[model samples]
Target: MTRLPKLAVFDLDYTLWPFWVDTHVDPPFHKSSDGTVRDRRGQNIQLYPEVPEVLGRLQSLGVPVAAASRTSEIQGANQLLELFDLGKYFIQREIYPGSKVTHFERLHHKTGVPFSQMVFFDDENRNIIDVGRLGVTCIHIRDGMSLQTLTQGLETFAKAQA
Candidate 1:
């Protein structure tokens, strides 16, 4: 039997979306009449294209997802999630500047999930190493999240369990 994570955690900037939430895009995002996500300045904001499918796949697999971001643009990050209609995918979001160790600790505490039973995805190596030290299966994302990455993460988690 395949082993599935009890909880899945993701990073926002450069992991779910292509750009840094704080630097690349302006805040207070909104959806245009054409269904495009745009910032306050009307600059188009785009996700990794396969992000929805990855998250939706996890959701359909009965895994609950959460977000752990170290972006100072907390409001902008949350706003983008809402505008992209991706907010519903996350059960909890830890958006603040600090070591992701703190983020994972809070996730474990709040959700009552063991570190080993959770899987994490992020673009930063520092974050990956930091959270990986806590025994969570951490996957370093490159070019943002896709269905392939999610599948590989799940497979890695399964192998770890075995």
Candidate 2:
């Protein structure tokens, strides 16, 4: 396999953690809770069992990871640190128009890594397809973003990274 410079990027909102929490869980399940409980760290997201381990493996293998999404830098980072301690695994997280293509574009501009060496596994096919248009090989997850998928995608993307 050719050694293309690699970087793994992910989506936020409905992809990493449920974006619907404001409508679904907040004001009822979590409103009484302080603002601290409203992040991905605090949401009722069922993470995939394999994600952390696989991500650790990927990081061990020297593949850089980034979180590209439409989340606020202040809140999301804190939430990630709280929820999964993810601040350790990520290299760059852009919270702009954080759509897949936008993410890839920004990530590419930031890292200068090509699309070929990088692999993306996102729960949303629209995002996947959108990234695909930018020449990224994307995995379409049947069940959109879950902790399980996060773990699984890293497990698989780790293999692809090398």
> Against the true structure, what is every candidate's RMSD?
0.7, 5.4
lDDT of 1 by residue, 22-139 (tens): 9988888888999799998999889999999999999899899999999999999999888888999999999999999999999999999999999999989999999999999999
**Among these predicted structures, which one has the highest lDDT?**
1
lDDT measured at residue 122 in model 1 versus the true structure, 0 to 100: 92
lDDT of 2 by residue, 36-69 (tens): 3443235554334455665686587688988766
Clashing pairs in 2: 47-147, 48-147, 48-148, 51-151
Alpha-carbon runs more than 4 Å astray in model 2: 1-5, 13-45, 70-78, 96-99, 144-162
Question: What is the Cα root-mean-square deviation between model 2 and the actual structure?
Answer: 5.4
- Provide the overall lDDT of each model, using Cα atoms, as 2-decimal numbers: 0.93, 0.60
Model 1: runs farther than 4 Å from truth? none
